[PDB]
Structure 1
Amino acid sequence: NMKAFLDELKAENIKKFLYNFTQIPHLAGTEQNFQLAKQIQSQWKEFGLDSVELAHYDVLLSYPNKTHPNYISIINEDGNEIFNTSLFEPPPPGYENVSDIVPPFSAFSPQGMPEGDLVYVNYARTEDFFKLERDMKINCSGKIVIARYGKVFRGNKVKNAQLAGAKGVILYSDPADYFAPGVKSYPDGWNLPGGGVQRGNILNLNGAGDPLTPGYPANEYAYRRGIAEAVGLPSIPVHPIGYYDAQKLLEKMGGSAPPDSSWRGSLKVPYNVGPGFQKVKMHIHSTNEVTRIYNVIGTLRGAVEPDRYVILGGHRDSWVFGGIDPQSGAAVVHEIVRSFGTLKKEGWRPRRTILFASWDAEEFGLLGSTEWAEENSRLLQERGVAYINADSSIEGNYTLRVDCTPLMYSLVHNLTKELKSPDEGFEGKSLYESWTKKSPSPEFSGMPRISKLGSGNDFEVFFQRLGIASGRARYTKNGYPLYHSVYETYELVEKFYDPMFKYHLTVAQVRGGMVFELANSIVLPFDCRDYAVVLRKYADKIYSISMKHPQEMKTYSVSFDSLFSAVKNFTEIASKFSERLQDFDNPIVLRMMNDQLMFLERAFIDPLGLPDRPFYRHVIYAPSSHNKYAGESFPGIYDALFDIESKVDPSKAWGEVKRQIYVAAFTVQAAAETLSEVA
């Protein structure tokens, strides 16, 4: 049973694995990450899984030219390079003989050497550019943005800069965002040093996966698009830097003052917006190449319903050592596997099949999970019960953070009531109790906050494309300063985040317990009434956004009646379905009603996808078009409404709002009807 599963999980084992996974870098496409794949595969076999395979793909990756390094310069009137940005981050104590630390770079930047005047765009959010071009009338065409990291996924910043006419982008970490007050830089605390730099990709893939093979797995015979028809590439060069290098570029900034204090970081600088101050010159030399990646897929066959899959997955590739991101998730998955395999060795099997995955190339655009899911989509869509992600277990040590589909709200509520809080001041009390005192829902009542799933991690294809119920759980802060830098080490974790490994252990219990229950409970632990509740809230919300335009709603006859009508029927049919679920015995009726619960998330998929994003097919949730990390509810209506006052042809824009209301109402009705009696 479950308690046996949970008691077998040990903090010491997690620590031991984390140490083992973080001694060398494990960058996607390198031999070191292949070797770790082979190790994971051996150990998952010894741990007891029925099978463990490597699935490999040849996908577009991106690396810096080892002999022609990337950097940024200030240049004078005569073209001499008076300031050069660092070529590498200062390696942390004791790691100075590690080879193959990839220098800071923006994966997938095109090559180029643009010169021009700087403009400072704050976080390069959609609204930051709105402030620039609309209020301040500053024009970014032919300019070079600098933008600080924070708030939104860096791909969105680059996209916004492109559309504003920019010819390059420089990203940097501002200490207002990445330097927490009163704690020391690494190695003496967990803050970002001025030489530290955040790596990461800058693609705008919108669920496509490998940019060369959208729709189809990048296997041995795959037909690849030419690089110019590739999906999601930036067309301007991009490079990130630390805040020491950034102070040098920002201190000379002229032109307009910052519009208000929310544009000002905490470097001792004016934070003028520009343009200009001498010029800035980018040197970027990174190549794209097709490179083999390896997913490890472990199978633990179910005893009764082996054709029903519960998937626990997270990535293995890291930018550098991956002490938090991802090896603190991976070390948790490893111990979960060990523990399931221990039960299995004593003759136990879960009722449903469990798949365990170590994904590759997540850092480069979720490529490993996506290619695999493109290869196995027919299996996943007819047999896929649930996907639980397993990236970083900790990004802080304050409380639990859970993002999931409404179908798992009750499962998570119940599970955390049975678990001991690891928090200081809640010993004896339940994880539910600490989590809900520390992070209460705004949306009602005596309950913990659970957020919407956006994207930016490996659950994306499973949820947004295929409609498999998904969740994720980790310990969070009240990203983190050392995110995607060389300073993310084992030492960072043991010394400053989780010395006892008890937050790790709690996350392993939450992740492992969700999976256990999904794989073993007789009736699937999904509550469809939870979907009914949030659908009303999302419909109230999208309605209020529309009601900011009362005249247009009158003129174009914009009714939401059909959506509220669908949400009411969903509520009603969902009640009747839960009554039936309580009142029945009989392996056919059980299978039928489980298939209804399993397919309910599936019912929200529209095979035509959302407008211009064919691979985002969930009608209720999609990643925000302005921030891949954030989920948006009723995304088709929300985007049809966004900035609608600026459109040229209002009747066409409002026509499209109404079309999206119709699609959402139809889809909510049709979802509901999957829970009606079947005949």
Structure 2
Amino acid sequence: KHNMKAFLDELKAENIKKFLYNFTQIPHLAGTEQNFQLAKQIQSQWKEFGLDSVELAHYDVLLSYPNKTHPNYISIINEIFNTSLFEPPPPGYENVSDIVPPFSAFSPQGMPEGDLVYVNYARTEDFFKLERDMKINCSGKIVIARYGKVFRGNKVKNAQLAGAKGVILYSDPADYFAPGVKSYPDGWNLPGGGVQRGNILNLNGAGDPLTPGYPANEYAYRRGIAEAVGLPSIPVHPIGYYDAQKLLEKMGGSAPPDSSWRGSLKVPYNVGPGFTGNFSTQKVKMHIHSTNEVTRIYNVIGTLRGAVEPDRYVILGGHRDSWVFGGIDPQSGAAVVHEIVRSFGTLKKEGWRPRRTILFASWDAEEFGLLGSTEWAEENSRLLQERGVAYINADSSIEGNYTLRVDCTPLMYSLVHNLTKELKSPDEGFEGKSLYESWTKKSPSPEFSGMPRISKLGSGNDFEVFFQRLGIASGRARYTKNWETGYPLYHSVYETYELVEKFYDPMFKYHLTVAQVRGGMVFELANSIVLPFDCRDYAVVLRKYADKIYSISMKHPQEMKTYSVSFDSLFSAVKNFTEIASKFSERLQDFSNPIVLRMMNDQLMFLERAFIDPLGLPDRPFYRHVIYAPSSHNESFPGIYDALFDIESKVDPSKAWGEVKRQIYVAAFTVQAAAETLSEVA
């Protein structure tokens, strides 16, 4: 028999292990020769594995690299202390110059000299507290911020808008050093010389900064750097906590406002500005010489043509490019994808084909702003929006070994529940129990007893263009840590095969479980006669999110009275969606007729699509999903959430509340419009 069980049983832990080892012996930085060679290997092997076609899709995109003969560093100035030029390489590692040293991708060049201010996590809330409560002024200062809480690019944006002339990012042990675990190579903790790489862009979903809206192909017209989307305007550099201690220990001015501003280092965590008395005259100087360069990148796209609906695509995609060895990020994911392709190809060789086409993707330049997936989606956007059933992401399969973590559209909730009930838990103490049981026990729903937590999709990985721009139902699953105790070695040189094999998943059973969840989801989406989406699950969360956004607005009762701010239309639309989805589910259960089926499958496939506004969100044309797009000021209903954010500070309240009302109208309309796609069609 060729069914899901056949597919699932063919997956082997030992194969995922071999592929992970194979993928992590040398660095695979985007735009480098080694990553092109890995793309060619993957293309060859996917053909060997049995896919119908396997092609490279290349683009020429803006990337960013340190200058090899002119290293980046930070000084206290005579330069009396210098930060490191590289992380101490891990034991046994030999090509150390082709290891890219830590840097913040897309930093402009510069050598700003100045006095330090300590901005905690550089969140919106942290900057509000600096300026509004503490009357501290960041203008012309170098800010030093600790990583964590939010995307690092949001820190640099937040810093820019507060007027800073440089940002230093560092990893504080409070956030990145787990109590009682030994540092690499003897455990999975971050040593003091370790440094988190990462881009610092604010693209708002645009992809390559030079070609927003269109693929960076052979004839593309590019914006000048001056007009580019999302580039930072001030120099930025990341450092480890040994180097951070040296910079923070002399900090003067105001004490931290409270304990939530103090990390774990033996320093006061004084906010500044500037150093204390004796050193009040010393300064901090950045030396940043990185360059932005248009560089070729390569996606591998594998096709397994569907037997019955070859014009319906189920996509399994994850990135291949890594900062250095990519032992977790992304090769723990890519090894999983490779074994999934191998398993599907095994059934294919025996004569089986999925009902719908499966597309497999190995994305390039994910670490530089989701560039490979976004350019490919811009190139193929018409095919994807009329044919795209679903997108399952496949980055890092493990970031811990505690339990499963799923983020997806509500359309996939029932699919995920049903699948995980049929899979074996790999967890200690849950031998012979289902993954659903272990996951539900370790990560309970905050709302429903006997159900697991499933989170929303936001931003920051390759599902983003498919879900937030194109409105294709999307999901992701991986194994994660206990969230009451990212991960220490994230984007550091110490992310190695040995890290994973010794400390995360020596038996590769968590990898195998993640292969079963991702692979099983893809199998159902591509083979089930009726698409495995339950529109009733969207109705339930829409009411929750409407309740939530109403509750935020209701912090301002006087203004809602004055400006006649009603959420009645939004609740009405949610109620109608609930009633219509209920009736549609009845019809879906109550229908031999493949036109009615495919009509019904089309209604299910285009339901996610109906939440797209072709006008996008305000000033963010590439975020178009009205329920789930990222907030500019990071809740769901982001248009209304952003209109309400810090509304009490707006100088023209009439105008501000008018815009809240406009967003309520757009949201109610969109909800009702999506509901009407599930009505009888004529």
**What TM-score do the two structures reach when normalised by structure 1?**
0.98
Deviation of 1:97 after TM superposition, in Å, equals 3.8
Q: In structure 2, how many angstroms separate the alpha carbons of the residues matched to 1:21 and 1:644?
A: 49
Q: In structure 2, how many angstroms separate the alpha carbons of the residues matched to 1:344 and 1:296?
A: 20
Question: For 1:49-103, what per-residue CA distance to the aligned partner results, in whole angstroms no more than 9, with x for missing partners?
Answer: 000000000000000000010000000xxxx111100000000000044440000
Q: Is the 8 A contact 1:309 1:353 kept in 2?
A: yes
Q: Is the 8 A contact 1:156 1:626 kept in 2?
A: no
Q: In structure 1, how many angstroms separate the alpha carbons of the residues matched to 2:348 and 2:435?
A: 28
Deviation of 1:202 after TM superposition, in Å, equals 0.1
| 1:295 counterpart (292, 296, 299) | 299
Q: Is the 8 A contact 1:475 1:507 kept in 2?
A: yes
Q: What SS is found at the alignment partner of 1:255?
A: coil
Q: Which stretch shifts more, 617-626 or 124-133?
A: 617-626
Q: Is the 8 A contact 1:454 1:624 kept in 2?
A: no
Q: What SS is found at the alignment partner of 2:26?
A: coil
Q: In structure 1, how many angstroms separate the alpha carbons of the residues matched to 2:178 and 2:312?
A: 45
Q: Is the 8 A contact 2:75 2:83 kept in 1?
A: yes
Question: For 1:362-410, what per-residue CA distance to the aligned partner results, in whole angstroms no more than 9, with x for missing partners?
Answer: 0000000000000000000000000000000000000000000000000
Deviation of 1:39 after TM superposition, in Å, equals 0.0
Deviation of 1:624 after TM superposition, in Å, equals 3.3
Q: Which stretch shifts more, 585-594 or 25-34?
A: 585-594
In structure 1, stretches of 5+ residues that fail to align are none
Q: What SS is found at the alignment partner of 1:379?
A: helix
Deviation of 1:587 after TM superposition, in Å, equals 1.1
Deviation of 1:445 after TM superposition, in Å, equals 2.8
Question: For 1:626-672, what per-residue CA distance to the aligned partner results, in whole angstroms no more than 9, with x for missing partners?
Answer: 44xxxx30000000000000000000000000000000000000000
Question: For 1:544-589, what per-residue CA distance to the aligned partner results, in whole angstroms no more than 9, with x for missing partners?
Answer: 0000000000000000000000000000000000000001131111
1:662 and 1:370, CA in 2 relative to 1: closer, same or farther beyond 3 A?
same
The count of aligned residue pairs is 671
| 2:90 counterpart (89, 92, 102) | 92
Q: Is the 8 A contact 2:631 2:639 kept in 1?
A: no
Q: Is the 8 A contact 1:24 1:98 kept in 2?
A: no
Q: Is the 8 A contact 2:445 2:452 kept in 1?
A: yes
Question: For 1:17-37, what per-residue CA distance to the aligned partner results, in whole angstroms no more than 9, with x for missing partners?
Answer: 000000000000000000000
Deviation of 1:622 after TM superposition, in Å, equals 1.2
Q: Is the 8 A contact 1:538 1:633 kept in 2?
A: yes
Q: Is the 8 A contact 2:610 2:673 kept in 1?
A: yes
Q: Is the 8 A contact 2:61 2:294 kept in 1?
A: yes
Q: What SS is found at the alignment partner of 1:81?
A: coil
Q: Is the 8 A contact 2:207 2:375 kept in 1?
A: yes
Q: Is the 8 A contact 2:633 2:642 kept in 1?
A: no
Q: In structure 1, how many angstroms separate the alpha carbons of the residues matched to 2:159 and 2:311?
A: 47
Residue matched to 1:670? 673
Q: In structure 1, how many angstroms separate the alpha carbons of the residues matched to 2:255 and 2:94?
A: 42
Q: In structure 2, how many angstroms separate the alpha carbons of the residues matched to 1:532 and 1:571?
A: 5
Question: For 1:316-344, what per-residue CA distance to the aligned partner results, in whole angstroms no more than 9, with x for missing partners?
Answer: 00000000000000000000000000000
Q: In structure 2, how many angstroms separate the alpha carbons of the residues matched to 1:533 and 1:218?
A: 40
Residue matched to 2:218? 220
Q: In structure 1, how many angstroms separate the alpha carbons of the residues matched to 2:497 and 2:610?
A: 43
Deviation of 1:287 after TM superposition, in Å, equals 0.2
| 1:17 counterpart (11, 16, 19) | 19
Q: In structure 1, how many angstroms separate the alpha carbons of the residues matched to 2:157 and 2:256?
A: 22
Q: What SS is found at the alignment partner of 1:409?
A: helix
Q: What SS is found at the alignment partner of 1:551?
A: helix
Q: In structure 2, how many angstroms separate the alpha carbons of the residues matched to 1:120 and 1:89?
A: 24
Q: In structure 2, how many angstroms separate the alpha carbons of the residues matched to 1:44 and 1:623?
A: 35
Q: Is the 8 A contact 1:27 1:318 kept in 2?
A: yes
Q: In structure 1, how many angstroms separate the alpha carbons of the residues matched to 2:406 and 2:548?
A: 22
Q: Which stretch shifts more, 661-670 or 435-444?
A: 435-444
In structure 2, stretches of 5+ residues that fail to align are 276-281
Q: Is the 8 A contact 1:152 1:626 kept in 2?
A: no
Residue matched to 1:452? 456
Matched, 1:584 2:591: yes
Deviation of 1:601 after TM superposition, in Å, equals 0.1
Q: What SS is found at the alignment partner of 1:622?
A: coil
Q: In structure 2, how many angstroms separate the alpha carbons of the residues matched to 1:194 and 1:585?
A: 65
Q: Is the 8 A contact 2:543 2:574 kept in 1?
A: yes
Q: In structure 2, how many angstroms separate the alpha carbons of the residues matched to 1:128 and 1:349?
A: 54
Question: For 1:168-222, what per-residue CA distance to the aligned partner results, in whole angstroms no more than 9, with x for missing partners?
Answer: 0000000000000000110000000000000000000000000000000000000
Q: How big is the alpha-carbon RMSD for the aligned residues of Structure 1 and Structure 2?
A: 0.6
Q: Is the 8 A contact 1:408 1:526 kept in 2?
A: yes
Deviation of 1:110 after TM superposition, in Å, equals 0.3
Q: In structure 1, how many angstroms separate the alpha carbons of the residues matched to 2:460 and 2:249?
A: 33
Q: Is the 8 A contact 1:125 1:626 kept in 2?
A: no
| 1:65 counterpart (64, 67, 89) | 67
Deviation of 1:623 after TM superposition, in Å, equals 1.8
Q: What SS is found at the alignment partner of 1:212?
A: coil
Q: What SS is found at the alignment partner of 2:25?
A: coil
Segments of 4+ in structure 1 off by > 2 A? 96-99, 624-627
Residue matched to 2:620? 613
Q: Which stretch shifts more, 562-571 or 581-590?
A: 581-590
Question: For 1:591-615, what per-residue CA distance to the aligned partner results, in whole angstroms no more than 9, with x for missing partners?
Answer: 1000000000000000000001000
| 1:649 counterpart (648, 652, 669) | 652
Q: In structure 2, how many angstroms separate the alpha carbons of the residues matched to 1:51 and 1:623?
A: 35
Q: In structure 2, how many angstroms separate the alpha carbons of the residues matched to 1:536 and 1:588?
A: 32
Deviation of 1:444 after TM superposition, in Å, equals 2.2
Q: What SS is found at the alignment partner of 1:310?
A: strand
Q: Is the 8 A contact 2:631 2:641 kept in 1?
A: no
Q: In structure 1, how many angstroms separate the alpha carbons of the residues matched to 2:94 and 2:266?
A: 31
Q: What SS is found at the alignment partner of 2:89?
A: coil
Q: In structure 2, how many angstroms separate the alpha carbons of the residues matched to 1:435 and 1:395?
A: 15
Q: What SS is found at the alignment partner of 1:239?
A: strand
